[PDB]
């Protein structure tokens, strides 16, 4: 019967609420009292990328944090070089419609999507030196909202028909499919150990699932409206969300339950991008009033903001080796930090 | 400096392949196409290895090209995407116009077109976009004939109280309670229409009967309109 | 989580009175709008009032215009709607429902049993 169903399911959150409430012994600021804060971190932009005629909505580095990949809704990704400024390839887009882009670790795959419903994996060293798409890989029925690679072979996409797919690149079949939200998904994040990943969808919740296994494991609710960022806290064993609510949180898989909330009254914009530093003590989030903003995730404090961009900046990502952060905007134009 | 030329001579090759890329995609107008009861799509290609479409049968954005005049144009529009279009709408921030197609004929239905009329006009990504109205289907016999009072969707105005424009331009023989009914319905438009829009975004009302029409020609003469207002106000003349 | 419980559906011959009340629980009710959606038998889901963070504007669907009265207590978190002289076609399931954005004009919501912030509803039948 749907109505028993529904007021055991009631019970069963009670239970959760309750044993969350269990747990909250003390607050995670009372436990950060008395530590030094971070103090005012200026922002200088030392490099403008400049080539990308509409608007940016994604982009990655690589795993040597020099070249980064950049997608934009004319229809092109550029791989820049970061140190010099210099763009090596320049591929042209099926689909004007990108939403989503990733470089692979190895360095030798990107990855792009978007409203055409398909992931499109291209292959950047060729014998011949000319790059051009090696995969499209289908089957989702809405909009790749993020795809981020695991290896050469496997990559894991969002969509926006509320699931997450695995897909294996020389098969070119789903493997496992992620399924359980009811909004569509906006963002994911590998974790470190590459074993789990989140992600975060419109219905203001997030999940935890197992690429190896199918199943979401914990599920965290917290935001009162539509989670659009999410990555993972260097040591994997926790995630920030960043939603339409202009507030950002931190979770915890152990702790089950948010630990910090980062708002602030003059602040009433959502958040576009979310990623943190390497030593996890700056957050940077990308906001829709043109700027980003670091966060002490110790101590919930604004601790610096990198005004600059003239339009809403949409992506945003620290560099492996910690030396560099790139944003990137609805201006068309990246810009990279220190 | 050996590998440093060569990297220089790629990035220069680049940004000329890229500045020929910038020429052509100025040259173009993109459109999206709103809607649940349009088929002009179909009438637009014709007018306008093979010519199979090896489209996958999930695509979610469909695209059609035409061109008026030399002047080219994109339109897109949605296919197999969900329902919710909160975050996907926000791609076309920056198109040249959005065609917004409403069937006047059923109206049932045309409160909640409206409300999808005003929920676009009102969108924060979407506030400097001016929108086309094809009221579609506008072959009224329902109207000719007495089964369905537009007292409904209106059970205020039409329901006595609305008097033909003085403006309106009743088509060449034709009965004038018809003529009162579709003027009425364009008028719920453009009120919600005005009630925010200003120089920002207009909204450009066509009583597209039916879809089997001339129908681009429209479309480029509000493109045009657009683009001419736009100009005249970064010189600030109007 | 962000849940809405609605309340006062019930059994009215035509012409009656009845009065519902939406209780609105895991966000700050004044930062966004609210709605009223109801679905027919057999007919999908219908925008039907709405009232603005502060209630100054508030809009009706035609067929409802002139009868049924909505109003909201942000100190209450919650939204109501007082109805009065019902005629048998407002037999549906009513579901309050919220905008998904705060501080903004814009709202998609009556969509296809699929939108999250919206209530489990009340039967009403007249």
């Known amino acids: 019967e749907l109505d028993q169903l529904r007021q055991e399911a009631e019970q069963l959150k009670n239970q959760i609420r309750d044993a969350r409430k269990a747990c909250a012994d003390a607050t995670l600021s009372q436990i950060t009292n008395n530590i030094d804060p971070v103090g005012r971190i200026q922002m200088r932009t030392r490099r403008t990328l400049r080539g990308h005629l509409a608007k940016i909505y994604a982009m990655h580095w690589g795993t040597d944090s020099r070249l980064l990949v950049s997608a934009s809704q004319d229809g092109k990704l550029i791989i820049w070089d970061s140190y010099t400024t210099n763009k090596v390839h320049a591929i042209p887009l099926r689909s004007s419609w990108v939403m989503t882009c990733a470089y692979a670790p190895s360095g030798n795959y990107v990855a792009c999507g978007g409203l055409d419903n398909i992931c499109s994996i291209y292959n950047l060293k060729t014998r011949e030196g000319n790059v051009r798409v090696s995969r499209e890989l289908a089957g989702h029925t809405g909009y790749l909202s993020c795809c981020r690679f695991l290896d050469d072979n496997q990559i894991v996409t969002s969509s926006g028909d509320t699931t997450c797919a695995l897909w294996d690149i020389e098969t070119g079949q789903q493997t496992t499919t992620f399924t359980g939200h009811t909004g569509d998904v906006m963002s994911l994040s590998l974790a470190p150990d590459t074993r789990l990943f989140v992600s975060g969808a419109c219905d203001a919740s997030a999940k935890l699932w197992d690429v190896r296994e199918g199943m979401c494991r914990q599920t965290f609710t917290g935001h009162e409206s539509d989670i659009n960022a999410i990555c993972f806290f260097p040591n994997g064993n926790a995630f920030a969300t960043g939603s339409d609510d202009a507030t950002c949180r931190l979770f915890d898989l152990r702790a089950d339950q948010e630990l910090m909330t980062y708002s602030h009254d003059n602040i009433i914009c959502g958040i576009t991008s979310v990623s943190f530093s390497k030593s996890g003590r700056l957050l940077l989030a990308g906001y829709d009033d043109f700027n980003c903003n670091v966060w002490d995730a110790l101590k919930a404090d604004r601790a610096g903001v990198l005004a600059g961009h003239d339009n809403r900046v949409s992506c945003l990502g620290v560099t492996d080796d910690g030396m560099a952060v790139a944003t990137g905007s609805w201006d068309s134009f990246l810009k990279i930090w220190n | 400096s050996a590998e440093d030329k060569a990297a220089v001579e790629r990035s220069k090759m680049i940004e000329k392949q890229l500045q020929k890329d910038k020429q052509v995609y100025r040259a173009t107008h993109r459109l999206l196409l709103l809607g649940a009861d349009n088929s002009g799509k179909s009438t637009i290609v014709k007018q306008m290895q093979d010519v199979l479409r090896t489209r996958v049968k999930t695509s979610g954005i469909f695209e059609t090209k035409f061109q008026v005049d030399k002047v080219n144009f994109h339109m897109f529009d949605v296919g197999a995407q969900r329902d919710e279009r909160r975050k996907w709408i926000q791609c076309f921030n920056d198109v040249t116009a959005i065609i917004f197609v409403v069937d006047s004929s059923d109206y049932n239905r045309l409160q909640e077109a409206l409300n999808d009329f005003k929920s676009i006009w009102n969108n924060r990504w979407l506030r400097t976009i001016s929108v086309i109205l094809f009221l579609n289907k506008q072959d009224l016999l329902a109207e000719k004939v007495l089964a369905g009072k537009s007292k409904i969707e209106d059970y205020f105005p039409e329901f006595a109280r609305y008097t033909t424009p003085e403006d309106a331009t009743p088509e060449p023989g034709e009965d004038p309670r018809v003529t009162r009914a579709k003027y009425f319905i364009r008028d719920e438009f453009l009120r919600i229409s005005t009630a925010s829009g200003d120089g920002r975004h207009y909204c450009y009302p066509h009583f597209t009967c039916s879809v089997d029409t001339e129908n681009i020609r429209r479309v480029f003469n509000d493109c045009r309109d657009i683009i001419q207002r736009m100009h005249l106000r970064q010189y600030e003349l109007l | 989580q962000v849940q809405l419980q609605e309340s006062g559906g019930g059994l009215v011959q035509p012409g009656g009175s009845l009065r519902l009340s939406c209780a609105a629980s895991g966000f700050t009710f004044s930062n966004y709008k609210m709605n009223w959606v109801r679905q027919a038998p057999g007919k999908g889901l219908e925008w039907v009032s709405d009232?603005?963070?502060?209630?100054?504007?508030?809009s009706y669907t035609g067929s409802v215009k002139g009868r049924f009265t909505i109003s909201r207590d942000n100190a209450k978190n919650t939204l109501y709607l007082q109805m009065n002289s019902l005629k048998p076609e407002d037999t549906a399931v009513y579901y309050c429902?919220?905008?998904?954005?705060?501080?903004?004009?814009?709202?998609?919501?009556?969509?296809?049993?699929?939108?999250?912030?919206r209530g489990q509803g009340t039967q009403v039948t007249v």
């Open positions: 429902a919220r905008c998904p954005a705060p501080f903004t004009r814009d709202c998609f919501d009556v969509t296809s049993t699929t939108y999250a912030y």
């Open positions: 009232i603005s963070q502060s209630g100054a504007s508030i």
